[PDB]
Amino acid sequence: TKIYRCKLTLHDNVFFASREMGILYETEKYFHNWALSYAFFKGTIIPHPYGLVGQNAQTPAYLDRDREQNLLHLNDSGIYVFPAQPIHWSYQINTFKAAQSAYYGRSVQFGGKGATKNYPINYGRAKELAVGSEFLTYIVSQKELDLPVWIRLGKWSSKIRVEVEAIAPDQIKTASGVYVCNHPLNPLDCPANQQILLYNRVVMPPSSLFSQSQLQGDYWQIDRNTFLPQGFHYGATT
Amino acid sequence: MLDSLKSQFQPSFPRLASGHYVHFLMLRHSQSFPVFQTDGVLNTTRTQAGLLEKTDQLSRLVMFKRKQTTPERLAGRELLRNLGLTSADKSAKNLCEYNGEGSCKQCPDCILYGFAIGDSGSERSKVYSDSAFSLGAYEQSHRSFTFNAPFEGGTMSEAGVMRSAINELDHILPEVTFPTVESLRDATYEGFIYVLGNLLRTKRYGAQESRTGTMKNHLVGIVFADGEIFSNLHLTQALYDQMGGELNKPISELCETAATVAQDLLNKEPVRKSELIFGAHLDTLLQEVNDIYQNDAELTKLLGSLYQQTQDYATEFGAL
Amino acid sequence: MLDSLKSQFQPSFPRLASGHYVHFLMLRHSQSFPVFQTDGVLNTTRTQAGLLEKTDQLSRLVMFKRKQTTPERLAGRELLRNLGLTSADKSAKNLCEYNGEGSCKQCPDCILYGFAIGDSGSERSKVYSDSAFSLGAYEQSHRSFTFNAPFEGGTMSEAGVMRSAINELDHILPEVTFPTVESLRDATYEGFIYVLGNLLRTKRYGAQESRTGTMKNHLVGIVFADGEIFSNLHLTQALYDQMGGELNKPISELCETAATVAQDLLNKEPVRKSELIFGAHLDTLLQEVNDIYQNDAELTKLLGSLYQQTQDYATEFGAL
DNA sequence: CACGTTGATTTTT
DNA sequence: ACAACAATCAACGTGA
């Protein structure tokens, strides 16, 4: 029922380890929906356990009712964030290191002696999304929503200004047919009574998004040049 | 002061994050030539000069979260080793090592700044932070200094051949200010004294800290809130605009103008705020924490309790 | 004094910082026209003139970072060679090449002041130093002197043509004073005697040592500490304010003014202070250390012990 | 997991 | 007159 046009401005550089090639780790230019859903609603709705230990410390709980860090809490809260479209962007490639806390340091080869386990020993280069960037998302909810005007994202918990407007009922309209979505859209969240006819894809962990799609189903023309899929909810394909 | 604030904090570390944030508002003032570099240059980004609707872009120096958090973090671990709460010896039962498998799961550093071993445990950082920015432009805020390394016999030549050991290096200037908000979630009272300790007790940052890089962390306010208040960039763009770009001002005018800009911003940001420690209440609070960090009995007591609380969190809710 | 101070130090060098800073508070007074340059002019920076009262901007000279650690470092190395603990001949088992491969990785210079070239790793300097600032403004504190170079025939021509070998250079005036804190981390007692020896035994600093740049280091305090005290710039800005900018005072009154501002500032630092050697206790200790450096048996023993300490650190935790 | 081992590229008026 | 640096930062295989 309610729809919020939220534009995200980076107030410091955002890193996600989306792909890795040698010394270089890089960030995809679309913020994945599930990452933004926890950035908005973790602590307010979804639980935020400070510690983990066990299998729960390296296995996601995305869509597992048995665990506390679910995105399904939000299905029951009647809320859905869409993934983020880049409106304006830049990248910085910045090195990062391991600290030499001891007075003496030996450069050790990764996998050598004293280095035989997967940890960030030595150095790497992160291709971060930079302060010079702006992204656009939509949140759809069935209740007026107290959205936080600051969020944190990614590998380094980096600040985003969220400036948000509710799209009023005088300028949205509801319809059904074939439509080009033109915003990003997560295929895992697609229900029955939507079908995807065409898509162009952005290959990305944890699951690939569409950057552009043609759908058949119900939609909201939220301004005269974008069409948002109606009825999407977290994990609806399962 | 501290006797009144003891109500605000959690009585012991919670499992889930509850949304109590104590925010430290600071100006980090450069005192001698820091070098916040990666990739062989001083880190910079283009930004808008200020919040009042400028066309005007400005290259400002960026101190990344790593470059400020790790110097605070490591200055806590050496304090805990000096109090004898943790050890450097591989044969001790209270060993803690900074990054590998040998990280503790109990000590104050591990619970407040976090750890990740793998399946054997991990803990999220309770100290939230942002990348800090120079209040002025890079062109105003740096100078490049030559270095050389001759033979001990005083000469760039040895055996009639020249050393290649000359280059330039880039340095930030001795008055450059980096407005900062550091934020601490869901902390106990002693957790606040440990972290506020790091902010006041650590004094060197960036590369070549053996030779350079002293900074003065001037605390400007402490703010208790239900949520995240504003970014370093947003404070810096507000502070530039409150000055209209006359950046050539003394440290005390720059701190008092930051204290009123912080309160101008806090009135607009939609989170509820329990306490706003500024001015003479901050200067008495700072004296009352300086009095802990100068007293052997008082500090070993508080940090002993912190240890216990974090050792109890570890065994009750943490990585056991 | 030395009989009690011995207890504060560690019995051998650790691999990790265990608190235990010793801070050497000094005034470095110019005696014979120092040249402190990079990029062909005397190094200078704009600073607030003093902390609280005299809040106007002022340019002051900068004794930049290594200009106050390479003199110390090299003077200690020629003592290690004089005592025969290290050598400068190739094909001797105790060679130590300065700033190359073939650095010893075991001698007191290699451990206390650090190394980073070639295989066998890198070592962080246990002496922490910082860039020092002139207490006065540049304008009252420098002069430009013409130099020329004729032919040995006593004239600027050898065939009727001119040599034109004429140029200016800027030199810092005598009695110009640079307040500074040198800091030593995790020393043994013999390591303190070595570093303190360098500070009292060095006397030339700038460019053109062969002709210029003598200085007088007056140690004004030694402070045992749980962590970093104030920056060089902060002690300078405090000392200028205490004099009101009236800097034409004798060196005895200036060393006594530095002593009272350093003690005022130390009582505002979040640092447990184990020992605070000043005044009549410091001019006791300085004599008890002069008695080491004037005695051939005592110095050989002490610095020989240091060699063992630093060679054992090397085999136990360092370069093996 | 804990022992052991040691070759490769082609060039910026 | 003449230097603009210098090093270090695996990739497997085999047996227990």
TrEMBL record, chain A:
Key words, A-Z: Plasmid
InterPro entries noted in UniProt: CRISPR-assoc_prot_Csc1 (IPR017576)
Database matches in NCBIfam families: cas_Csc1 (TIGR03159)
This protein's name: Slr7013 protein
Organism: Synechocystis sp. (strain ATCC 27184 / PCC 6803 / Kazusa)
Automatic annotation (TrEMBL), chains B, C:
Source organism, top-level taxon: Bacteria
Keywords: Plasmid
Name assigned to this protein: Slr7012 protein
